[PDB]
Amino acid sequence: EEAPFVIVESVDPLSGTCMRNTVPCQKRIISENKTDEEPGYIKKCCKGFCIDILKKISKSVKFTYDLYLVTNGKHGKKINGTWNGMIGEVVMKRAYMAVGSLTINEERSEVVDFSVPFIETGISVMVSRSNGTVSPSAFLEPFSADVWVMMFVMLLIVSAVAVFVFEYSFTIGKAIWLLWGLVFNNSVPVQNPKGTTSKIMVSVWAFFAVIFLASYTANLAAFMIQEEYVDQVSGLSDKKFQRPNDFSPPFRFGTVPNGSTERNIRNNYAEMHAYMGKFNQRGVDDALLSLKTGKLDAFIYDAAVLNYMAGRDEGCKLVTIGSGKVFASTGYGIAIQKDSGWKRQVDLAILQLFGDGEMEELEALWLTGICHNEKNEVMSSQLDIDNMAGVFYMLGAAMALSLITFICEHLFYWQ
Amino acid sequence: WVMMFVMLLIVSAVAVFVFEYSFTIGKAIWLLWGLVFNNSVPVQNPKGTTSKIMVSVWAFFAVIFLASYTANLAAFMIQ
Amino acid sequence: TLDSFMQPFQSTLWLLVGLSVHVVAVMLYLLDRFSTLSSAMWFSWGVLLNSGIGEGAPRSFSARILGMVWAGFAMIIVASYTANLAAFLVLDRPEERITGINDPRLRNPSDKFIYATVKQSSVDIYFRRQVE
Amino acid sequence: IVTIHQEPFVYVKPTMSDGTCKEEFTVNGDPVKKVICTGPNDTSPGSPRHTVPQCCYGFCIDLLIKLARTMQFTYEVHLVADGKFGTQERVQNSNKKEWNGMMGELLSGQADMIVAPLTINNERAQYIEFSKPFKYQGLTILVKKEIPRSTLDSFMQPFQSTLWLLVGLSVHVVAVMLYLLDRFSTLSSAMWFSWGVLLNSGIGEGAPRSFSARILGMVWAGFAMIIVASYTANLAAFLVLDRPEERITGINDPRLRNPSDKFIYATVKQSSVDIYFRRQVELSTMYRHMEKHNYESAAEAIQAVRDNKLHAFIWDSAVLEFEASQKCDLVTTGELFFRSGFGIGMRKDSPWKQQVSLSILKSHENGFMEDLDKTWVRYQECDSRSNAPATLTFENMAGVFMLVAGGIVAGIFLIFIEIAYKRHK
Amino acid sequence: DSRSNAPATLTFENMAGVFMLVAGGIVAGIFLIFIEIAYKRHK
Ligand SMILES: *[C@@H]1O[C@H](CO)[C@@H](O[C@@H]2O[C@H](CO)[C@@H](O)[C@H](O)[C@H]2NC(C)=O)[C@H](O)[C@H]1NC(C)=O
Ligand SMILES: *[C@@H]1O[C@H](CO)[C@@H](O)[C@H](O)[C@H]1NC(C)=O
Ligand SMILES: C[C@]12C[C@@H]3C[C@](C)(C1)C[C@@](N)(C3)C2
């Protein structure tokens, strides 16, 4: 039993059995080790995705079946060179066939024989969604250096020609100071000349300055309305994973053990496993619950169930990195005892569903969610210091330039 | 807007009380009105020292208010 | 509509800009001393709030450049403030909207979601008769 | 080996006189493995169809090299004669049915391994037993997108010519009204008192003493502020709204669901997409329109789409996406359907089946396939979304820059007029 | 009302937040004037 593929639920107490569109799945219960009673069994009935696909294949091939849940063990890890769980049971000829979530790799394929995959998945990660937007230097986004230097040179030229007009106590510093103060919302208080043509020129400059400012605010606001949300971690080769201890208090991320994900990550990267050695978690539900309370920063598991779980949780506060980039993409399958004639038959029968298109409707019915991955990007708010540090950096640079220029001028006038 | 008008009235009365301890009620209302719309119109300064503190908060109010009006307006037009 | 002065900004920004105003006033006083003491703060505050108050611009050159950049800062601050206010003002989450009969909310009901109709009506006949 | 080049899995280029082609260094300069192919020259039938030697390279050849080195066998590749994937077709009105294309090449003695973009379906799984796929994919649709509106002029965009005139008349009208009020109970000063407050700039010290005139000015200041705010809001609202596009949703689009005389689309001849469309009974209504307009190969179809002759193209998702991000005049849209990966084809009796099927998973698990994907697929190019928030270019600056100079020359002319006026008095 | 986007005009929730500040400034004005005259007369 596994949540998005095979679901088990109690039978109807009044009728004595459960609803239709389902098949019974007998369940074995454990007993006291002192004296085991006669093997007890409890009638349960299982419904889901793989169960329905099995029901379709069985009618297509016209054979009967009787399925039962596994007593002990997950999908299976090797101990003492011997298997447990479903993959262990299929070897001992008691089951002869398996169905459900079972990732395909080389170790399991070296024991039993598989069928062509009918779903795509792999290794993926998810992180909580940070509130705000990545806008480091948004004030530089509007305009470009070309217009910034062009307006400098234009104001220099107009100030020079204004001084030339004044030739035929308007000084040179006051002339440029007036225009520079006036271009920025007429904030600075200055003194004005007594020349009519100079008045016309400064009125034209004021027209230009006003047109400027409104465009700049609208361009910046528009731009903000269109902001892109980018995940913090680029991928599995990011420095935030390989070098975990040097950035900040170390991240809180872990994997569920006794799984194919741990086996895949062990051989590729051992030090990561050494770090995981203390941050394991009980199960999918516990990890999903703990993600929201800040106890964990990242989570690694099979992408097939995470993609479903993202769109089913209340709200859309949980996302996945990038475009759902799967790592080491493999597919689920149907385990079959080695060297059996039914393998080719069932493999050819399952491919028949590709052409008919029934599986597409089936999976749209059984797997469609609510949330979207199309960059919702709700809003940035509160304008944290990190969002606008560059302006204060420029202010500090201007202060340093002012002090060094004052020292240089004092030295020049000292001699 | 009636709250705006009564605010101008009460601030003008407070300014007169300040001046008790060529500023007149004719130019005080002119200044209070002008600072609302970006202080475009030239005006006569208040010589009193505390009058500057009295009007600085009014200018702060005016700029906050003004910005909000533009901003809100953009949204309204966009929808 | 939240708090007018707290919706787009945190307090830390207010304290930081106030400290910047004070330190730039001190710097203006230092430049004036090296080459009015009570007028630097008035100049800074008038530039910050676009007030009609004003006594006199500094006479030094580097003081003029510093005043220019200080005047430049406030325009960026106020423009960002408006822009942030708007975005906030126009984007509202569309959550909790059932599309209809094909919504996966209804096709796979959960315990936290409850819905029902009036017994012995056309709805009961329509639902019971269909076999899917 | 028998293999074709679609877009990215095999590249075909002529060799030099020496009998090979000079190596092309990678981005880091690493060598690019190649191999001497023996394939037909040209494409169109009726040419001097005599074989020539040439060199090949791509995302698939290096995988073949790795497979050969791991399993220790030699090879000698050669391309296909007809350049078609191949499917069943009854010929000569006889009882027996025989394939053509790669199907015939592998099924009768000609080849041993098909290492190419081969799709897995029921028909080809009957006569060939495949291997585990190395790259999943699907089917998408290719369309063309239209350039949106420009940034326009500084003044023309948010205001049409009809205004400006009325505000220019009204400012002088109110100036005249103020002058008349002053005269009844300084005429030049009123013009500045009006123009400066409109322009948000301080000029002069115009302080009228009339009660009514002061009221009128106090009223007009708000009008000026409203005009400025309305202009800003107009430009901001226009600068963010985008023109909606068609962006055909997919196989459920009504345009694809029934034939139209202003919407033509096609697919390459005799391939798996044709089998998928023909096999199903309900999809005949558009297959019937498709069968009269099919083309020869994808190397010709994508060239025709740019030249405005096809409104759609149904083909592989991977190949289309690779050529969707390389040339940004074309955009891919829709959702994947008929999801089935590729594979390596074998006859039904060979240990190479098992050995290759194990080795391909071995190489797939340890990230080598991701390295190949980064090397040959994900270099990417111009892909500037669809809304594309546009930084305003010279378009805005040119007009204002020209005005500044026009104002300067008008100012010097008015200066000459000023000396004239001074002489006149 | 109708529609979905619902662009709503602002109300007194915005007004009172700044009316409190302006009223506080006005009421503190007299105290600051008293402090100012005391400091001017004492020195
Ligand atoms: C992973 O598998 C190991 C297999 O040894 C589990 O360890 C045993 O779990 C059972 C379950 O109750 C305990 O009774 C044993 O005492 C455990 N053995 C040891 C040596 O600790 C482990 O619990 C499994 N973990 C998960 C998350 O399934
Ligand atoms: C493996 O088997 C040996 C005996 O054959 C036993 O002592 C050991 O505990 C086993 N290991 C595990 C992990 O059960
Ligand atoms: C250009 C503008 C746009 C909006 C914010 C500013 C600060 C700048 C004040 C204004 N009146 C409204 C004019």
From Swiss-Prot, chain B:
Q: Which domain of life is it from?
A: Eukaryota
Spans within the Cytoplasmic topological domain: 47-53
The positions annotated as site (Functional determinant of NMDA receptors) read N38
**Coiled coil segments of this chain:** none
Tissue-specificity statement: Expressed in the hippocampus including the dentate gyrus (at protein level). Detected in adult olfactory bulb, brain cortex, hippocampus, striatum, thalamus, superior colliculus, with much lower levels in inferior colliculus, midbrain and cerebellum.
UniProt intramembrane annotation = 27-46
Changes after translation? Phosphorylated on tyrosine residues.
Q: Where is this region: Pore-forming?
A: 27-46
Q: Where does the protein end up?
A: Cell membrane; Postsynaptic cell membrane; Late endosome; Lysosome
Bilayer-crossing regions: 1-18, 54-69
Fill in the subunit field for this protein: Heterotetramer. Forms heterotetrameric channels composed of two GluN1/zeta subunits (GRIN1), and two identical GluN2/epsilon subunits (GRIN2A, GRIN2B, GRIN2C or GRIN2D) or GluN3 subunits (GRIN3A or GRIN3B) (in vitro). Can also form heterotetrameric channels that contain at least two GluN1 subunits and at least two different GluN2 subunits (or a combination of one GluN2 and one GluN3 subunits) (in vitro). In vivo, the subunit composition may depend on the expression levels of the different subunits. Found in a complex with GRIN1, GRIN3A and PPP2CB. Found in a complex with GRIN1 and GRIN3B.
Q: What is known of its domains?
A: The extracellular N-terminal domain (ATD/NTD) endows NMDARs with a unique capacity for allosteric modulation, harboring several binding sites for small molecule ligands that act as subunit-specific allosteric modulators of ion channel activity.
The entry's function note states:
Component of N-methyl-D-aspartate (NMDA) receptors (NMDARs) that function as heterotetrameric, ligand-gated cation channels with high calcium permeability and voltage-dependent block by Mg(2+). Participates in synaptic plasticity for learning and memory formation by contributing to the long-term depression (LTD) of hippocampus membrane currents. Channel activation requires binding of the neurotransmitter L-glutamate to the GluN2 subunit, glycine or D-serine binding to the GluN1 subunit, plus membrane depolarization to eliminate channel inhibition by Mg(2+).
Family per record? Belongs to the glutamate-gated ion channel (TC 1.A.10.1) family. NR2B/GRIN2B subfamily.
- This chain belongs to the protein called Glutamate receptor ionotropic, NMDA 2B
Give the lineage: Eukaryota, Metazoa, Chordata, Craniata, Vertebrata
Curated annotation (Swiss-Prot), chain C:
Q: Which residues are glycosylated?
A: N108
User: Residues annotated as region Pore-forming?
Assistant: 37-58
UniProt's post-translational modification comment states:
NMDA is probably regulated by C-terminal phosphorylation of an isoform of NR1 by PKC. Its phosphorylated state is influenced by the formation of the NMDAR-PPP2CB complex and the NMDAR channel activity.
Write out the tissue specificity statement of the associated record.
Detected throughout the brain, in brain cortex, cerebellum, thalamus and olfactory bulb.
Localized where?
A: Cell membrane; Postsynaptic cell membrane; Synaptic cell membrane; Postsynaptic density membrane
| Parts of the chain that traverse the membrane | 11-31, 65-81
Q: Where does glycine bind?
A: S122
Looking at the record's lineage, which domain of life comes first? Eukaryota
Could you tell me which regions are intramembrane? Answer: 37-58
On the Cytoplasmic side, which residues? 59-64
Q: What does this protein do?
A: Component of N-methyl-D-aspartate (NMDA) receptors (NMDARs) that function as heterotetrameric, ligand-gated cation channels with high calcium permeability and voltage-dependent block by Mg(2+). NMDARs participate in synaptic plasticity for learning and memory formation by contributing to the long-term potentiation (LTP). Channel activation requires binding of the neurotransmitter L-glutamate to the GluN2 subunit, glycine or D-serine binding to the GluN1 subunit, plus membrane depolarization to eliminate channel inhibition by Mg(2+).
What does the subunit comment say?
Answer: Heterotetramer; the NMDAR subunits are modular and harbor tiered domains that function in concert to regulate opening and closing of the cation-selective ion channel pore. Forms heterotetrameric channels composed of two GluN1/zeta subunits (GRIN1), and two identical GluN2/epsilon subunits (GRIN2A, GRIN2B, GRIN2C or GRIN2D) or GluN3 subunits (GRIN3A or GRIN3B) (in vitro). Can also form heterotetrameric channels that contain at least two GluN1 subunits and at least two different GluN2 subunits (or a combination of one GluN2 and one GluN3 subunits) (in vitro).
> Domain notes, please?
A hydrophobic region that gives rise to the prediction of a transmembrane span does not cross the membrane, but is part of a discontinuously helical region that dips into the membrane and is probably part of the pore and of the selectivity filter. The extracellular N-terminal domain (ATD) is a site of allosteric regulation to modulate overall receptor function.
Q: Which family does it belong to?
A: Belongs to the glutamate-gated ion channel (TC 1.A.10.1) family. NR1/GRIN1 subfamily.
Q: What is this protein called?
A: Glutamate receptor ionotropic, NMDA 1
Q: Give the originating organism.
A: Rattus norvegicus (Rat)
